[PDB]
Every structure is written in structure tokens, then in C-alpha cells.
Amino acid sequence: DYLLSANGSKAIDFVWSNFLKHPYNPKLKQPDANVKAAWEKHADWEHWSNMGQDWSLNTPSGLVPRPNHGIAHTLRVAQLVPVIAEFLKAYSGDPKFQKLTQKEIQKAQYMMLFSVIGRENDMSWTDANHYQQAFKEAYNGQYSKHIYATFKENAQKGFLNHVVTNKSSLIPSLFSDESELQYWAEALDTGKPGISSASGILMALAHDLDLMRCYDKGKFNSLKMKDLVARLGGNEDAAKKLADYAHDLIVATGDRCMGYGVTQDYNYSLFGKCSLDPNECLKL
């Protein structure tokens, strides 16, 4: 179980201590008034309050920051990677999954520990496109760095700060050489790398299955479950087994589950205990 390897432990401690335990950035909670006014003209866009959604969650043991993209989500999506790889080996009929090696699956798991470290709020990519356009429309065409390019930069800086002092522990046992580590540093992006490769698709499915925490059943089914069914050779029973695993990891961490299976609200005490100590997620 690679999250318990010396390399997995060191990365978990790094992402928890330097990123995931900290609050989102109050400067990114909402736009300035001029940007708000430009945004509000686009009546088709979701409201700019999306920038402040899911900001924190009160629990009996502490205020959990970034509750939709925190340590519990990070460790579940990492845990899902080798399990999704086994379902794709068993059911997909696709040789690029059948041939995935253990070291390739460990690299994809390891990289998912860094998948959301750069976020400074919970806004979506579309929300960030709206902020950039409303900023240009409020300020006479002026460029503003797209917020998800900020987030990628934040995550790449964290990833490169960690790997630079750990190259002898990482190479060649996990990354075969510095070129393979280079490709992953360039690929790293928020949520999933968006790359069509056996590893890229495995990492995207891990991020997508965990979205049952925050999508309702209709939405999850249309956007994610039908494509999973097709990825697993059309086998709905196989897809249900894998979505049931993801559901059970979510509810084990006390998190909400809205999009699949038996829905449940937060178990606040359990979610606070899991979110305020990475070791409680691993023990589950």
C-alpha cells in the first residue's frame, strides 16, 4: 500500500503541512466591486459567490479549511488510483490499462497527493474564466492571470520544493530518471492533469469518482457514471462495484455523499477527526 511507503509518507506530510491544512486565501473569496458589477451583467453566469463557496466547515474538533478539497479528498483520490487501475485491468479490455505496471500506478497515486495543493479557493475553472473576463470588462481590457494558472504555479512550486531534496529517495525507485520526474512536474495541474494517457485517464477517473461528494445523483450519473460504465467495457455491475468502493471511502472519512448510493450528510465529528489528522484517513 504505497501511501504507507517512505516516499508516500514524506509526500503526505509535505502536502498536509505546507498546503492542505491552511485556509483558503481571503483575497480570493470574492471579486472587487468593479469586477462584481461587470460579472453581474452576464445573467447566464453563475453568481460570483461561487468564489466563497465551501470555504470552511465547522466541526467539533476544529474549523476544517477547504473542506471540499482538503486532506480527506486528497488521500481518497490517491487511494482510488490503484483500485481503479485493477478495475480497468479486469474490465476495460484495453491493453494500455492491462499493461500498466505497478511503478506506473505508484507514480500516478503519488502525483495525486499534489493534485489540489495549489487551490486558494473552491471556484471552478468556468468561474475563473468568468473572473478573468469580468476583470477585463471592468478594467478596460486589462489582463489578469487566470486563477487556475495561479493554482498550477502554486502546486508546481510545492511539488518542486519537495522533490528537489528527495531525488535519491524518488529516483529510480518511483520515477525512473529525472526526465520522467520532469514530465510529471509539467503535467501537474489542479484536480487532474487533463492528459490522454493510461496514467492521465487513471488520475482523471480518481478525481471524477470522488465528485459524488459534491454532485447530486443526476449530475454525477450524467457527467461521470455513464462514462465509467463505458470505460469498463459497458459493464454496469463492475462500475457499481467501483463506485460503491468510492462511496464507502467517502463515508468512512465522515464526508458528505450526494451523488451515488446511499446519500448522507457530513458526520461532523468523524470528518473533523479525519480532516485534522492525515493519519486518521490512512487508518480507515
XYZ file of C-alpha atoms in Angstrom:
284
model
C 0.000 0.000 0.000
C 2.210 2.868 -1.413
C 0.776 5.687 0.666
C 2.483 3.982 3.572
C 5.911 3.837 1.751
C 8.667 6.135 2.895
C 8.101 8.239 -0.280
C 4.276 8.354 0.261
C 4.580 9.278 3.905
C 7.044 12.054 3.234
C 4.762 13.482 0.492
C 1.680 13.283 2.665
C 3.393 15.148 5.453
C 4.649 17.722 2.961
C 1.306 18.440 1.292
C -0.571 18.492 4.621
C 1.949 20.760 6.437
C 2.639 23.247 3.671
C -0.722 23.441 1.858
C -3.741 21.459 2.761
C -4.008 22.273 6.477
C -4.178 26.019 5.733
C -7.212 28.167 4.998
C -8.144 29.393 1.615
C -6.938 32.928 0.695
C -9.313 35.671 1.847
C -8.170 37.830 -1.006
C -9.866 35.313 -3.369
C -13.148 34.994 -1.535
C -14.952 37.428 -3.817
C -14.169 39.886 -6.600
C -13.711 43.623 -6.048
C -16.788 45.804 -6.613
C -15.864 46.804 -10.151
C -15.361 43.089 -11.168
C -18.651 42.147 -9.399
C -20.520 44.752 -11.394
C -19.111 43.546 -14.715
C -19.828 39.911 -13.757
C -23.428 40.620 -12.724
C -24.239 41.812 -16.234
C -23.816 38.281 -17.529
C -27.033 36.870 -16.329
C -26.173 33.377 -17.728
C -23.106 33.094 -15.450
C -23.284 31.547 -12.037
C -23.033 34.194 -9.366
C -19.596 35.324 -8.149
C -20.453 33.957 -4.672
C -19.149 30.716 -6.112
C -15.683 32.158 -5.161
C -16.563 31.900 -1.490
C -18.422 28.524 -1.528
C -17.212 25.646 0.583
C -14.784 27.906 2.293
C -14.539 26.067 5.663
C -16.569 23.657 7.779
C -17.143 23.833 11.488
C -16.702 20.508 13.300
C -16.485 19.518 16.959
C -12.703 19.283 16.870
C -11.794 22.354 14.766
C -12.564 24.564 11.800
C -11.685 22.446 8.750
C -10.379 24.598 5.875
C -11.034 23.838 2.230
C -13.489 21.045 3.098
C -14.327 20.117 -0.499
C -10.612 19.885 -1.486
C -8.711 19.051 1.638
C -6.687 16.220 3.120
C -9.600 13.729 3.122
C -10.337 14.304 -0.561
C -6.563 14.152 -1.398
C -5.997 10.871 0.357
C -9.224 9.287 -1.043
C -8.386 10.191 -4.603
C -4.834 8.829 -4.087
C -6.274 5.611 -2.631
C -8.648 5.234 -5.552
C -5.829 5.213 -8.111
C -4.619 1.575 -7.653
C -8.195 0.323 -7.188
C -9.407 1.973 -10.422
C -6.303 0.516 -12.149
C -7.364 -3.012 -11.065
C -10.920 -2.470 -12.339
C -9.616 -1.188 -15.678
C -7.206 -4.200 -15.934
C -10.196 -6.593 -15.205
C -12.979 -4.980 -17.214
C -11.802 -2.394 -19.785
C -10.471 -4.763 -22.467
C -7.985 -2.009 -23.274
C -4.338 -3.024 -23.458
C -2.973 0.369 -22.297
C -4.622 -0.421 -18.932
C -3.984 -4.088 -18.972
C -0.265 -3.387 -19.393
C 0.039 -0.651 -16.702
C 2.875 -1.571 -14.370
C 2.924 -1.328 -10.579
C 5.521 1.502 -10.786
C 3.321 3.451 -13.248
C 0.313 3.061 -10.912
C 2.504 4.214 -7.912
C 3.632 7.301 -9.843
C 0.029 8.223 -10.654
C -1.001 7.669 -7.000
C 1.914 9.729 -5.741
C 1.127 12.608 -8.072
C -2.480 12.714 -6.947
C -1.213 13.717 -3.444
C -0.338 17.041 -5.103
C -3.489 17.346 -7.156
C -5.169 20.176 -5.197
C -2.369 21.788 -3.227
C -2.342 24.944 -5.292
C -6.010 25.881 -4.746
C -6.639 29.166 -2.863
C -10.471 28.892 -3.055
C -13.105 26.421 -4.281
C -14.096 28.166 -7.503
C -14.465 26.193 -10.691
C -12.459 26.576 -13.897
C -15.533 28.195 -15.515
C -15.853 30.555 -12.552
C -12.172 31.516 -13.146
C -12.823 32.142 -16.828
C -15.707 34.463 -15.690
C -13.463 36.284 -13.210
C -10.799 36.874 -15.926
C -13.411 38.135 -18.430
C -15.256 40.284 -15.848
C -11.841 41.765 -14.842
C -11.088 42.644 -18.492
C -14.552 44.150 -18.851
C -14.288 46.149 -15.551
C -10.703 47.443 -16.347
C -10.707 48.431 -19.928
C -9.221 45.214 -21.367
C -6.534 44.598 -18.744
C -5.027 41.175 -18.350
C -5.295 39.292 -15.147
C -3.581 35.944 -14.673
C -6.211 33.175 -14.871
C -6.764 31.931 -11.297
C -6.149 28.300 -12.318
C -2.807 29.320 -13.840
C -2.034 30.707 -10.338
C -3.134 27.463 -8.804
C -0.893 25.406 -11.193
C 2.022 27.651 -10.379
C 1.378 27.204 -6.658
C 1.215 23.446 -6.995
C 4.325 23.183 -9.227
C 6.328 25.299 -6.752
C 5.265 22.951 -3.874
C 5.947 19.802 -5.879
C 9.430 21.040 -6.983
C 10.294 22.195 -3.423
C 9.546 18.710 -2.153
C 11.116 16.581 -4.866
C 14.365 18.596 -5.022
C 15.609 17.276 -1.722
C 14.274 13.797 -2.249
C 15.663 12.791 -5.604
C 17.747 9.913 -4.269
C 14.655 8.528 -2.471
C 12.452 9.064 -5.575
C 14.755 8.036 -8.434
C 14.949 5.348 -9.571
C 12.526 3.620 -7.179
C 9.493 5.639 -8.224
C 10.487 7.893 -11.138
C 12.967 6.069 -13.357
C 15.049 9.185 -14.061
C 14.906 12.972 -13.833
C 13.165 13.178 -17.269
C 10.255 11.117 -16.012
C 10.074 13.374 -12.917
C 10.196 16.385 -15.334
C 7.202 15.174 -17.312
C 5.152 14.849 -14.090
C 6.235 18.260 -12.843
C 4.990 19.827 -16.121
C 1.839 17.766 -16.071
C 0.780 18.569 -12.578
C -2.421 20.611 -12.604
C -5.416 21.233 -10.328
C -7.639 18.185 -9.876
C -6.296 16.140 -12.752
C -3.605 16.582 -15.349
C -6.032 16.550 -18.360
C -3.816 14.203 -20.322
C -4.897 11.317 -22.540
C -2.550 8.549 -21.496
C -3.211 5.463 -19.476
C -1.850 7.261 -16.358
C -3.692 10.500 -17.160
C -7.019 8.743 -17.570
C -6.477 6.732 -14.358
C -5.836 10.003 -12.434
C -8.871 11.669 -14.047
C -11.135 8.736 -13.028
C -9.893 9.003 -9.410
C -10.784 12.683 -9.342
C -14.089 12.066 -11.107
C -15.281 9.251 -8.829
C -14.749 11.384 -5.720
C -17.110 14.037 -7.107
C -20.021 12.008 -5.726
C -19.225 14.003 -2.556
C -20.467 17.283 -4.138
C -22.635 16.395 -7.175
C -26.182 15.342 -6.941
C -27.226 11.978 -8.340
C -28.472 13.137 -11.664
C -25.467 15.207 -12.312
C -22.969 12.569 -11.240
C -24.735 9.969 -13.356
C -24.762 12.064 -16.497
C -21.346 13.563 -16.257
C -19.290 10.755 -14.688
C -21.051 7.373 -14.163
C -22.104 6.752 -17.766
C -18.588 7.295 -18.994
C -17.221 4.993 -16.280
C -19.632 2.266 -17.361
C -18.272 2.676 -20.909
C -14.667 2.687 -19.747
C -15.308 -0.629 -18.002
C -16.397 -2.305 -21.222
C -20.040 -1.400 -20.704
C -20.177 -3.442 -17.552
C -22.609 -1.665 -15.193
C -22.090 -4.200 -12.353
C -18.330 -3.531 -12.453
C -18.874 0.230 -12.425
C -21.258 -0.132 -9.477
C -18.618 -2.104 -7.528
C -16.065 0.655 -8.132
C -18.489 3.478 -7.311
C -19.517 1.601 -4.182
C -15.819 1.461 -3.129
C -15.528 5.253 -3.664
C -18.788 5.823 -1.714
C -17.544 3.756 1.119
C -14.209 5.651 1.296
C -16.144 8.924 1.430
C -18.480 7.881 4.208
C -15.519 6.254 6.184
C -13.958 9.761 6.340
C -17.227 11.363 7.511
C -17.568 13.370 4.378
C -20.854 14.083 2.601
C -22.013 11.830 -0.208
C -24.654 13.315 -2.538
C -24.124 11.747 -5.968
C -24.237 7.907 -5.659
C -25.506 5.202 -3.389
C -26.987 5.942 -0.009
C -26.673 9.716 0.354
C -25.550 11.155 3.629
C -24.742 14.440 5.109
C -21.413 15.149 6.847
C -20.682 13.194 10.005
C -19.109 16.199 11.546
C -17.233 14.601 14.341
C -15.749 11.932 12.094
C -14.974 14.403 9.306
C -13.261 16.763 11.769
C -11.117 13.898 13.149
C -10.146 12.717 9.611
C -9.556 16.199 8.237
C -7.410 17.479 11.077
C -5.006 14.455 11.123
C -3.903 12.784 7.880
C -3.103 9.588 9.766
C -6.863 9.040 10.585
C -7.672 8.749 6.856
C -4.989 6.166 6.307
C -6.097 4.050 9.222
C -9.597 3.644 7.774
